[PDB]
Amino acid sequence: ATNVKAMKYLIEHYFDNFKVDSIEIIGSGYDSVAYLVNNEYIFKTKFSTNKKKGYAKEKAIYNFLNTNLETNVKIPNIEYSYISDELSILGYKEIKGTFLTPEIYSTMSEEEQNLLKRDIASFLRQMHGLDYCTIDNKQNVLEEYILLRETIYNDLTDIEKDYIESFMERLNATTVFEGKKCLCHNDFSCNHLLLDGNNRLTGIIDFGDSGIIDEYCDFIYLLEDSEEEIGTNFGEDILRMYGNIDIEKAKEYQDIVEEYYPIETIVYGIKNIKQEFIENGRKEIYKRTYKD
């Protein structure tokens, strides 16, 4: 009840004639909280964070996409924004629908599933085809590795160090970063995909990590085999509908990103001074090392 009151205050303070009649927490990330306001608006908010210029880019991307996409699929359209080092708020009309989940997918008929895959391939084809906020993942990883070496690397165990070095060797030998670059959503998982009443794709949210990056990026979660995502076959079928893309390299890219995840988690802990993340990522290295 306290969070909500503070945020109600801040919204009314920064957005003058805006009156909050109702407000509830509708979701969060580790660094942010989203509120549903007057059963009509989403307000995404974040306080003093690592990515100081963060909601600025996300806003620029919504504006660029709302200008240049021709699609029936809805994405946030920013009506309110306040951006500062200490606090950032984006407001838009709530995109209505039901988030895609494995459970829901499994109730869909084969035809419904096909239409959804087609809708997704279609959206991605259009977004990736836009004449275009660069992101270089290889370079980012190298910089993160340098940060590790400068901070906690020497205190890690041999098993941990070997996991990291083995990954860096793979990163150095892969060719998966040498392909097409385009504007990608870059966090394209089923918890960001909204379905209408006929199980068709009706909206997509959270372009907060979006940028000009490897084309393979937008298939990483579609290809993921986990309890949260639909499955590898879902991503394969979409890749086939999308067309003109090397499927084996897309899978290599996903597999490399998945291998990086524990390390990414450690790095997040270091940068944000959150020991819990350092510990979790290290423990995940052991779990993966002993999986057979």
Ligand X SMILES: Nc1nc2c(ncn2[C@@H]2O[C@H](COP(=O)(O)OP(=O)(O)O)[C@@H](O)[C@H]2O)c(=O)[nH]1
Ligand Y SMILES: CN[C@@H]1[C@@H](O)[C@@H](O[C@@H]2[C@@H](O)[C@H](O[C@H]3O[C@H]([C@@H](C)NC)CC[C@H]3N)[C@@H](N)C[C@H]2N)OC[C@]1(C)O
What residues are labeled active site? 187
Give the shortest CB-284-to-ligand Y separation in angstroms.
Answer: 9
Say whether residue 206 binds Mg ion (CB under 5 A). Answer: yes
3-state SS string for the chain: CHHHHHHHHHHHHHCCCCCCCCEEEEEECCCEEEEEECCCEEEEEEECCCCCCHHHHHHHHHHHHHHHCCCCCECCCEEEEEECCCEEEEEEECCCCEECCHHHHHHCCHHHHHHHHHHHHHHHHHHHCCCCCECCHHHHHHHHHHHHHHCCHHHCCHHHHHHHHHHHHHHHHCCCCCCCEEEECCCCCHHHEEECCCCCEEEECCCCCCEEEEHHHHHCCCCCCCCCCCCHHHHHHHHHHHCCCCHHHHHHHHHHHHHHHHHHHHHHHHHCCCHHHHHHHHHHHHHHHHCC
Q: Find the part of the chain contacting Mg ion (CB under 5 A) among 91-99, 204-212, 263-271, 282-290.
A: 204-212
CA distance 286 to 292: 12
Q: Find the part of the chain contacting Cl ion (CB under 5 A) among 36-44, 50-58, 245-253, 270-278.
A: 270-278
Say whether residue 215 binds Mg ion (CB under 5 A). Answer: no
Q: Find the part of the chain contacting Mg ion (CB under 5 A) among 37-45, 107-115, 155-163, 205-213.
A: 205-213
CA distance 222 to 25: 27
Q: Which residues bind to ligand Y, rule: CB under 6 A?
A: 186-187, 189, 209, 221, 224, 226, 228-229, 258, 261, 264
Give the shortest CB-147-to-Cl ion separation in angstroms.
Answer: 16
Q: Which option in Mg ion, ligand X, ligand Y, none does residue 264 bind, with CB closer than 5 to 8 A by kind?
A: ligand Y
Candidates 75, 193, 278, 285: give the one binding Cl ion (CB under 5 A). 278
206 is in an annotated binding site: yes
Give the shortest CB-26-to-ligand X separation in angstroms.
Answer: 5
Give the shortest CB-112-to-ligand X separation in angstroms.
Answer: 20
Any residues with CB less than 8 A from the CB of 64 and at least 6 apart, and which? none
Q: Which option in Mg ion, ligand X, ligand Y, none does residue 284 bind, with CB closer than 5 to 8 A by kind?
A: none
Nearer to ligand Y, 145 or 221 (CB): 221
**In the complex, residue closest to Cl ion by CB:** 279
Q: Which residues bind to ligand X, rule: CB under 6 A?
A: 26-27, 29, 32, 34, 42, 44, 76, 94-95, 191-192, 205-206, 208
Closest CA to 85 of 60, 50, 52: 52
Give the shortest CB-6-to-ligand Y separation in angstroms.
Answer: 26
Say whether residue 279 binds Cl ion (CB under 5 A). Answer: yes
Q: Which option in ligand Y, Cl ion, ligand X, none does residue 12 bind, with CB closer than 5 to 8 A by kind?
A: none
**Binding region for a gentamycin:** 206
Q: Which residues bind to Cl ion, rule: CB under 5 A?
A: 278-279
